[PDB]
Amino acid sequence: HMIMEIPAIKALSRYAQWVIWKKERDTKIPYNPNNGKKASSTDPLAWGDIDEAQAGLVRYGANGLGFVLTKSDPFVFIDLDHVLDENKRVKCEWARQLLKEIKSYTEISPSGDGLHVVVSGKLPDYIKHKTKFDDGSALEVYESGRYMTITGEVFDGRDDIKELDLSILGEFAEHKILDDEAIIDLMKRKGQWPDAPKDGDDWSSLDMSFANRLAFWCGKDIERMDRIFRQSPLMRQKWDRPTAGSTYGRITLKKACDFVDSVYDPALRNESDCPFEPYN
Numbered sequence: 001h002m003i004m005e006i007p008a009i010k011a012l013s014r015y016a017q018w019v020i021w022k023k024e025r026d027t028k029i030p031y032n033p034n035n036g037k038k039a040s041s042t043d044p045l046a047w048g049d050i051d052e053a054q055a056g057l058v059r060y061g062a063n064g065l066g067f068v069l070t071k072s073d074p075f076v077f078i079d080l081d082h083v084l085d086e087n088k089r090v091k092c093e094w095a096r097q098l099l100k101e102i103k104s105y106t107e108i109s110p111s112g113d114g115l116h117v118v119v120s121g122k123l124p125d126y127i128k129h130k131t132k133f134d135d136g137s138a139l140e141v142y143e144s145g146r147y148m149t150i151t152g153e154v155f156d157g158r159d160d161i162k163e164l165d166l167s168i169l170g171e172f173a174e175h176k177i178l179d180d181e182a183i184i185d186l187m188k189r190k191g192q193w194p195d196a197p198k199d200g201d202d203w204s205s206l207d208m209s210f211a212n213r214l215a216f217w218c219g220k221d222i223e224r225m226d227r228i229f230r231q232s233p234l235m236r237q238k239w240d241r242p243t244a245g246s247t248y249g250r251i252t253l254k255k256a257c258d259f260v261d262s263v264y265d266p267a268l269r270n271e272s273d274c275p276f277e278p279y280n
């Protein structure tokens with residue numbers, strides 16, 4: 001009764017693309033409002049209308065409402081993280097400047113330190129989805145493929161979705177122009193994916209043990225081992241520090257390729273020829 005008074009929520013309530021979400025440790029997993037199952041962002045019949053989302057919110061005790069964004073709906077979702085201080089005022093200049101150029105429906109995200117802006121328009125095709133900043137804030141832009149939590153906490157009385165040109169987002173987002181994740185999932189299923197270093201562990205000794213495993217699974221493809229290492233819990237700034245005409249990471253990967261003798265062949269699937277045992 002309270003949130004349906006907002007003009008922007010009425011615009012969103014025309015679409016049967018509503019979900020509910022709940023806190024799993026420190027993530028916001030979306031759920032089907034009708035049966036409580038886990039909701040996909042590509043299955044339309046896993047969603048519901050706003051009345052079903054509000055009923056399921058009470059049925060399963062979820063944390064709040066959500067809205068799945070699709071290519072067909074005219075909405076763009078702008079996510080601004082860690083831009084509000086304790087008093088829920090903007091403390092980041094990039095976020096302040098963005099709100100002055102994109103005056104649409106703005107609400108305070110569930111954690112209270114962020115903002116959501118919902119606009120009607122088209123994203124520029126040359127910007128990254130996520131852009132991080134030095135102070136810790138971030139900017140996520142999505143027009144489809146994922147959902148957004150809905151709180152209804154209107155910020156600065158901006159309670160109406162406007163149709164704005166979004167080419168100005170190029171001033172804030174960074175520009176952008178077997179598979180890697182296939183190898184990662186393979187190593188994870190074999191217990192070859194390391195965990196974050198505990199205190200008292202020799203991190204560089206963990207780097208070499210993991211680089212040794214990468215040399216096998218990646219077939220000693222050093223450019224692939226490097227791309228995978230940067231996504232691993234062992235990545236740090238030392239990986240790119242210069243060390244005697246090279247980087248610590250390049251030297252670590254080249255020593256692993258020399259130390260390791262056998263390789264994993266995707267055609268042969270010689271998973272048993274791995275010389276290293278899984279982690280604990």
Ligand SMILES: Nc1ncnc2c1ncn2[C@H]1C[C@H](O)[C@@H](COP(=O)(O)OP(=O)(O)OP(=O)(O)O)O1
Pocket residue numbers: 027028029030079080081082109110111112113114140146147148149
């Ligand atoms: N684990 C997940 N799986 C699928 N979708 C997710 C997941 N976590 C978040 N989302 C969606 C809904 C969020 O609104 C959107 C932005 O992520 P996030 O900024 O981390 O949460 P939030 O914007 O809902 O509140 P806050 O930023 O204040 O914590 O992405």
Ligand SMILES: [Mg+2]
Pocket residue numbers: 079080081109114115
């Ligand atoms: Mg956020």
Ligand SMILES: [Mg+2]
Pocket residue numbers: 069070071072073074075076143144
């Ligand atoms: Mg859309």
